[PDB]
Design a protein around this ligand. Structure first.
Ligand SMILES: CCC(=O)Nc1cncc(C(=O)Nc2ccncc2C)c1
Lengths: 39, 156
């Protein structure tokens, strides 16, 4: 039996730890909801 | 049960100790997660119970107590925040410019941030604090890192 615990408000926070790249990727979505890279 | 808006951990006792299998959003009394987190199973909140209402394995989304409520979209330009909720660690915002998943059916925002699988369902926000989708369904890239779609449902 799964259960839920609150972990915070949903708020934009000024001066948060900025990071991550922005890749453009060719992907396929299967019937099972699994993505995969076309190439 | 606790119906306060905000972000929630999804936990199980079915493995060793308490294990966080994912995350979700409570909004307007509806709980929103990714399908691969719950598999459409019921959830406890206090001694309260949450029954599935809507789901789609292909969208990999599920709603509890009511229909999908989150209608905001990436504008295609602006930076966004992953409100990451990783296992055992405090809620932490992480700001990023989404990339793009190109598909036969269309282009989707994607966020390149590397967190454990139990972070699945953490929300992605716009500048106005509105949830534009959920993190935790995507692909493992040339580098070994994870890239997640911005997965949003439809509101009818
Ligand atoms: C460390 C890099 C990494 O893999 N992390 C990761 C991050 N967010 C989601 C998943 C994931 O696996 N989800 C998922 C999608 C579709 N079906 C099942 C499942 C578990 C994994």
């Amino acid at each position: 039996d799964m259960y839920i615990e609150r972990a915070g408000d949903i708020t934009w926070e000024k001066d948060a730890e900025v990071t991550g790249n922005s890749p453009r990727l060719d992907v396929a979505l299967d019937e099972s909801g699994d993505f995969s890279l076309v190439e | 049960g606790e119906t306060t808006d905000g972000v929630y951990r999804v936990m199980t006792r079915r493995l060793l100790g308490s294990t966080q299998v994912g995350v979700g959003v409570m909004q307007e009394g509806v709980f929103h997660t990714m399908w691969h987190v719950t598999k459409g199973a019921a959830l406890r909140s206090g001694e309260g119970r949450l029954d599935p209402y809507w789901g789609d394995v292909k969208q990999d989304l599920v709603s509890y107590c009511g229909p999908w409520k989150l209608d905001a979209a990436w504008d295609g330009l602006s930076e966004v925040q992953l409100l990451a909720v990783p296992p055992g660690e405090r809620a932490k915002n992480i700001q990023t410019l989404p990339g793009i998943f190109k598909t036969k059916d269309g282009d989707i925002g994607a966020v390149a941030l590397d967190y454990p699988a139990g972070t699945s369902g953490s929300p992605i926000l716009d500048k106005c604090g509105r949830v534009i989708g959920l993190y935790g369904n995507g692909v493992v890239i040339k580098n070994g890192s994870y890239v997640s779609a911005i997965t949003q449902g439809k509101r009818e």
